Write an enzyme that holds these catalytic residues in place. Structure first.
Site, short mmCIF file in Angstrom:
data_model
loop_
_atom_site.label_atom_id
_atom_site.label_comp_id
_atom_site.label_asym_id
_atom_site.label_seq_id
_atom_site.Cartn_x
_atom_site.Cartn_y
_atom_site.Cartn_z
N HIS A 34 0.84 -1.20 0.00
CA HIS A 34 0.00 0.00 0.00
C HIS A 34 0.88 1.25 0.00
O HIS A 34 0.72 2.14 0.83
CB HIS A 34 -0.96 -0.01 1.18
CG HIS A 34 -2.10 0.96 1.06
ND1 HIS A 34 -3.24 0.86 1.81
CD2 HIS A 34 -2.26 2.04 0.27
CE1 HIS A 34 -4.06 1.85 1.50
NE2 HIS A 34 -3.49 2.58 0.56
N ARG A 75 -15.81 8.03 11.58
CA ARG A 75 -14.79 7.31 10.84
C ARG A 75 -13.61 6.86 11.71
O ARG A 75 -13.00 5.83 11.40
CB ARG A 75 -14.29 8.18 9.68
CG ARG A 75 -13.28 7.50 8.77
CD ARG A 75 -12.95 8.40 7.62
NE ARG A 75 -11.96 7.82 6.72
CZ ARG A 75 -11.51 8.41 5.61
NH1 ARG A 75 -12.00 9.58 5.22
NH2 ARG A 75 -10.60 7.81 4.86
NI NI Z 1 -5.74 4.06 0.67
#
Ligand code: NI
Ligand code: NI
Lengths: 837, 837, 140, 140
Positions: A404, A606
């Site tokens: 990532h 969130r």
């Molecule tokens: Ni992301």
């Protein structure tokens, strides 16, 4: 000024030492880096005065800092401090030995030259474990078992000293040694491997010799007995001894016998397990502490036969005709050999030698000379064309895979490889606004440009495209250009239509789909995204939802069979400062205002404590299979490894050993967690056959660690069989160690060499198009494959499938009906003992 | 912060200045680097205040430091300090002239802004030699001998000033100058070259002109008189003068004659030798101090005719039609020319211009224009396509050759080239354990990788393989792959069998064998190694044996005819701190314990004061022919040059001039010692035809030094006719000089240019295989040769063969029966006046 | 007929009247290097086995009559890396006398049969007009 | 402009050139026997010259591509040694831009009889039973 480069690096060292001096002056206990910087800089300044000799500074350097001015781990981490300094005589090396050897140091000496007020000894607070310690049994191992043994009497008739090694053929020693050369035929000293016996002039000594094993072939030395061990060659050797004038006196009443597994056998040489572990690293049954954590890796097994360890150095085993094979084909000799290495992998924790050939892990086992040693196979021969890397007391691990990465700058590549990450998968084009938020490389032009720019870097690279489209056209175009995966992101549109389109394209092309789902729940809730998956394989980035995803129940994807879940590092582990950091970082990223209720409502929906605490348990039990970075997009590229181990430490602190583990070792937990950044990303992305483990036939992307520094700072990163990065000191030093020791790029980073050691992972469509020829890439290019039939059960050691349930109101997470909750960790290991800032 | 690249460099300058401030505050006398850093940083801070003008800081910078706050050499080394600073009205350059001009400086001004206590003037201790001084005679040289001369009366009729240079054709001058233009035909001002005569508007002067020489062709200017000097062109020029309206007035009784070697001739222009040396550099008979050493290099001869020196600048000699030739083919024009250079070489110490063409030393002699000057050959023409490098008052030396480099990191390459080393020979693959001990590049894969990684670096490279094998197979394989030599090493087995095998392979392949003999005396003593040589050529590394070798008498190899011996720098010269350094350095290197009697016995047997004192005499008399590094393996790559000269200084201090020298100069000693790192390594390794001396036809690997800084820090390193590295200041400065002045890489180091200027030295077997095509090397590749028939007599100026005898017990060394003993040196030059740390 | 002419024989050069006499021959009678089915150059017989791979000839022209301005001789020509590695007697030093280390036929050695053929250096034409590329083919 | 020239004998104009020069170098030419003493002797054939060998043919030519392809640098992607240029100025062209052939007759064709009129006048030409430049020149 006309500053040479060494003056610049020494000025940097002085700045680090002055920072350490200010910190010491205000009364904080220094860590390893600060202590080393202070001691080195003060030695340089005392040399600059010119009123001291090298010996005076060797004695003075041991008095600057005491145990009360440094953290409790520093006395064990810090064994010596080398530094070069310009005396009136010129540049001289001076090395302090055991610099922390008092309760309190001389603080006026430590702060000399800084013109800072010397603090009183009361200012240093008081509050242990040894990082990297080897826990051994109280047993004496026995060397060279099942061998013919003879005790001979040797006397030196020379006028100069004569050391002889453990594996040197004794019949071929200096002619000025007199002894029964007939009884020394095909024998070597029965002593610890790599040691020696010294004959001062006139010295007389009784030695014990044991037979060589293997093919029993004598080569090298004086060429007295060049050939296999038999009677005819014995007679030829004795004729050569008499003719060439080698000292020989028959000892008819010499003692003969065999080495047994007997304490009371006169022919046996014993060695304590602590001495063995110090000399060659731990063996079977020992335990290693991983850094300053609470995890103990026990050596499951050891390929070494005791007495025949491959040790390189002056008068040691790896030499012509003793441990370096000499009479074999040149083309079966290893290119490189890592000797006496402790290998931690998801498969097991073992002790072995790693032979590397043509940039691949040629073999794992016992290396050496089959002429002299038992248990050496033809794929583990150390020849005259074999480089040696010393793994004695070091841990070898596969290079981490970061799946990532946001390619926002090229400096994160250096930061990643300096920390032991050898493969980056992700997307980006630079600090453009589209890539600060997404791992998408949208344009084929940008795909070409990024494959060309990263062509010389000594890392493996994989680039993903923008899969957030409701029609397949541009997805086909970007997959054809080099993209090895696609990324669905909330910022481009992560709706069910886009999910369906991207997944059918993935099934067409055999690439992996990474998804960041809709946090706004604008098209549907998490059940509708899961419905859009239609049971097809998909990788979910930051499945918890702190990085993003369906608020509050994206974490339910950890229970889905076809979903491969991953976590990002900035939440690993939950700590006291995590929520404030993450909340206000989210506010900064999204340009939100705390004073508007809707913005703060989104932020609080969130960033959730309960769901992150559940993420910790799901990582522990194996429900989450991968730990990634999300670099510079709520993520730190240089902390994929350390944060992972921090999580493991926390889960041993607050849950005890796993079911498969015991109170003895933490081997199963260590394997489960090392799988999360080595092999599971490789399986998920589709290049598991090339990288991700220390296995034969895979690329030699290895990372050496000191056990005391495991998980924080590696000794060197080897890429494709060559050292890509390493800890090295002053270039103008007499030896490599003197400060400033920095993680520097090696010859694997220069010219067209860095491309010769690594792989550019692309799609099958791009390789069929020969994009390595179109773009003029010097790097190797391979196609990713086997990613569409993957389920959760293919993630190694992380195949759990709990039934997750998140409360819509309180965000409470239950797995199979049992609440998941862990306390906040007020501290973590692998952070404060090691890093200057 | 948004820090631009120049702010980072200025922050580094400030850090260096603050270090200098702390040192000054504790009362040590600053050196050149510290003084420059302090003055520049304080000028920057005063500019940051915004309460000063540029003139105020010009005056203030002369009062910060006095003669008592700096070392005695600093007032001579430090002429000015340029620095760029941001005033309230923008960025301005301010330069201090003669910053050390008082006995004591204003210490509150020197330490302003640091918030440090100002030390009293008593804290600076008391204790002279001028570094780089030119010792000239008290004589006046006479310019332009044997030329037709005329004294004319010129007057300006212009309203603004007209300055005329020394070599401008005087008939071509501004039309507003009135004078007899007929008598100025083919004449130039009889003044010092590069100077001028100024005519203020209306100014009326009397000038002396002398005829041009050579072909006597006038080019350029106003095109009044283009063509050869004759009667027809004189009439054409006078017609052009009348037509175009150039000031002409006949002077019938103008004085005419010839320039003589006569003090009382009215047409002669005289210049003092001190003024000449300041303007153009020293000439024949002058002497130059090499750095702050004892050594005086006397100019043996000078190729310059006094009056026609090639000087570049505004209104100076090297200009179109005056000192830049105009009527020659473009091809024979030099690519570049170093003008007025003092060339120190093992051949001699001369004064000449060096013309470089196509990256080779095209010629050495007198450059300029054959149309205007005498003594210019067709290989020394400065054309319009010729770059100029000013060697006025600088020393030009061949790039050093370091033949014992361990390729442990790529940063030692930068360290070496920044110090003037242009060629590295050795072996390695990185910080692997095998290469931290030996100069061996074992694998052919590693050979390819290292030739590819060093392909862009602007240095010459030679790699050696592992010759420590008893059969020739892998030795053939590694020689075929690119290796230009083999290394026998104790760590791999340096036994007689390996020596014999490696030497027969060397005789086959015409490569050199370097050896690290057996210190343990395990297979033989030094006599047995010499027997194994069998009279065959062999290079012996660190023949003294501090680096290693047969304990205690490896030094005997200095008496063997076929052995080419060398010494490594860390023992060069013996000083008070050498033995403690080397003992404990060996202890850390070999992992020895001082408390174990055998370990300390080995260490004391290896590090011996008597043989380290012997090697100083052996280097002085020429018994040791090469000085190498052993970089980062008990060796410093950036001190091969300086240490060499330090030894020379020591041996002049404690033995006086050599037999061939006198009390006047030290030319023979200088040649003998400069041969030890320039030409002798080149002859020993087999590429003396390409590099190793300032000779016509060789590669233009040159190093330009300021005479005051000779041996420590060069002004620039030229590689293949292009400046590879150079001392340069701030990139955003108005001129190149302002601080921070660092040795930076130049355009020779970027792109595919570094390979275009260098040579990769390989074996003949590898060049026949065309490894430059197999490995894709852009670098030039040449085969080494002529290394098997070499004896000690082939080493230039270091061909002595003393009969060496070492005592087994006391380690006393005798050469031809005479004890060799040298006192420890308590100081050395070239160390403390120059380096910050 | 079997191996080509030896010392003292004579060869007519084409249909000319010139006789080239073999000045000397490097072969020991009985150990000629002949390649074929059941012939000398075979593993362990005339193809060496116990030597380094890297001293093996790349190619060997066997039993060649070499005519050159230096002389007219009978020898084997060993070629390595595109250069004439050696001229002399090729074979196996384990089985044959007079084989030097630069004339070893190994398992990586190609064989050209010079039995009864003449070997000459390629001619050098120093007055070519490059008028077409077909004269290059005609010349070679 | 590029030196793409064709040299003709006036007696052979329009059928068989004496040589074709491409980019200043003779690409093809009428040449005789390679072993002839001079270039003329039979068989004289139009043969390829040194312009056609090696990497020389690409050095003398242009590969015409679109502007979109030149912006993408297809000469670098495909590894072309040939020069590459973009075509342009083709969208504003009318009949009046064709040199010496800019006539614009009003054409009318009969649907049934296929009779063609230009500006109302019948266009008709007789069949030619012979043509030049064919039979005096070609073997077949
Ligand atoms: Ni992301
Ligand atoms: Ni050595």
């Amino acid at each position: 000024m006309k500053l040479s480069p060494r003056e610049v690096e020494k000025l940097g060292l002085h700045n680090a030492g002055y920072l350490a001096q200010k910190r010491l002056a205000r009364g904080v206990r220094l860590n390893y880096t600060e202590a080393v910087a202070l001691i080195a800089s003060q030695i340089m300044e005392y040399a600059r005065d010119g009123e001291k000799t090298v010996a005076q500074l060797m004695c003075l350097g041991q008095h600057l800092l005491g145990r009360r001015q440094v953290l409790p781990a520093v006395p064990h981490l810090l064994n010596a401090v080398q530094v070069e300094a310009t005396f009136p005589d010129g540049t001289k090396l001076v090395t302090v030995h055991d610099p922390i050897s008092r309760e309190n140091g001389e603080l006026q000496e430590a702060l000399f030259g800084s013109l800072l007020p010397v603090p009183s000894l009361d200012k240093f607070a008081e509050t242990n474990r040894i990082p990297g310690e080897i826990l051994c049994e109280d047993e004496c191992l026995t060397l060279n078992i099942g061998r013919k043994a003879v005790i001979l009497k040797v006397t030196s008739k020379g006028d100069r000293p004569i050391q002889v090694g453990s594996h040197y053929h004794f019949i071929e020693v200096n002619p000025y040694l007199t002894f029964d050369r007939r009884k020394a035929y095909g024998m070597r000293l029965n002593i610890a491997a790599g040691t020696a016996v010294r004959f001062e002039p006139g010295d007389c000594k009784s030695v014990t010799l044991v037979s060589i094993e293997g093919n029993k072939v004598i080569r090298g030395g004086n060429a007295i007995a060049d050939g296999p061990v038999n009677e005819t060659n014995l007679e030829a050797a004795m004729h050569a001894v008499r003719s060439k004038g080698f000292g020989h006196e028959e000892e008819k009443d010499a003692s003969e016998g065999f080495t047994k597994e007997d304490p009371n056998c006169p022919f046996n040489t014993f060695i304590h397990r602590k001495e063995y572990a110090n000399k060659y690293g731990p063996t079977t049954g020992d335990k290693i502490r991983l850094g300053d954590t609470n995890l103990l890796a026990e050596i499951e097994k050891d390929y070494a036969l005791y007495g025949d360890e491959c040790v390189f150095g002056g008068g040691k085993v790896i030499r012509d005709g003793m441990g370096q094979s000499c009479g074999h084909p040149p083309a079966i000799s290893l290119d490189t050999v890592i000797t006496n290495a402790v290998i931690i992998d998801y498969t097991g924790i073992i002790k072995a030698d790693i032979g590397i050939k043509d940039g691949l892990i040629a073999s794992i086992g016992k290396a050496g000379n089959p002429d002299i040693m038992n248990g050496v196979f033809s794929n583990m021969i150390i020849g005259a064309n074999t480089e040696v890397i010393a793994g004695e007391g070091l841990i070898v691990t596969a290079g981490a895979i970061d799946c990532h990465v946001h390619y926002i700058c090229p400096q994160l590549v250096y930061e990643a490889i300096s920390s032991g990450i050898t493969t980056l998968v992700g997307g980006g084009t630079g600090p453009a606004a589209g890539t600060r938020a997404t791992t998408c490389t949208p344009s084929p032009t940008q795909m070409r440009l990024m494959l060309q720019s990263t062509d010389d870097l000594p890392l493996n690279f994989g680039f993903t495209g923008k899969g957030s489209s409701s029609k397949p056209d541009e997805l086909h175009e970007i997959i054809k250009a080099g993209a090895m995966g696609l990324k669905l992101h909330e910022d481009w549109g992560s709706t069910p239509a886009a999910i369906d389109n991207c997944l059918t394209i993935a099934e067409h092309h055999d690439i992996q789909i990474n998804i960041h789902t809709d946090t706004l729940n604008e098209a549907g809730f998490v059940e509708h995204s899961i419905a859009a998956f239609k049971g097809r394989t998909i990788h979910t980035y930051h499945s918890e939802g702190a990085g993003g995803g369906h608020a509050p129940d994206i974490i339910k994807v950890c229970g889905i069979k076809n979903v491969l879940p991953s976590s990002t590092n900035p939440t690993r582990p939950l700590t006291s400062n995590t929520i404030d950091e993450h909340l206000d970082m989210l506010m900064v990223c999204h340009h939100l205002d705390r004073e508007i209720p809707e913005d703060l409502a989104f932020a609080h929906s969130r960033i959730r404590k309960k769901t992150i605490a559940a993420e910790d348990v799901l990582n522990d039990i194996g429900a989450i299979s991968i730990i990634s970075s999300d670099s510079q997009a709520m993520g730190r590229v240089g902390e994929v490894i350390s944060r992972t181990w921090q999580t493991a430490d926390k889960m041993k602190a607050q849950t005890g050993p796993l079911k498969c583990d015991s109170s003895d070792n933490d081997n199963f937990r260590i394997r489960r967690y090392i799988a999360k950044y080595t092999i599971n990303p490789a399986i998920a992305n589709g290049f598991s056959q090339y990288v991700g483990s220390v296995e034969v036939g895979k690329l030699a992307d290895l990372v050496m660690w000191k056990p005391s520094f495991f998980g924080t700072k590696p000794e060197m990163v080897i890429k494709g069989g060559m050292v890509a990065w390493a800890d090295i000191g002053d270039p103008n030093a007499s030896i490599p160690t003197p400060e400033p020791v920095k993680m520097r790029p090696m010859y694997g980073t220069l010219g067209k060499a860095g491309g010769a050691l690594s792989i550019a992972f692309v799609s099958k469509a791009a390789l069929d198009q020969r994009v390595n020829v179109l773009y003029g890439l010097n790097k190797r290019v391979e196609a990713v494959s086997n990613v569409r039939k993957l389920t959760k059960l293919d993630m190694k050691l992380n195949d759990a499938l709990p039934e997750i349930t998140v409360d819509p109101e309180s965000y409470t997470v239950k797995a199979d009906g049992k609440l998941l909750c862990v306390s906040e960790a007020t501290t973590v290991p692998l952070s404060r003992n090691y890093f200057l800032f």
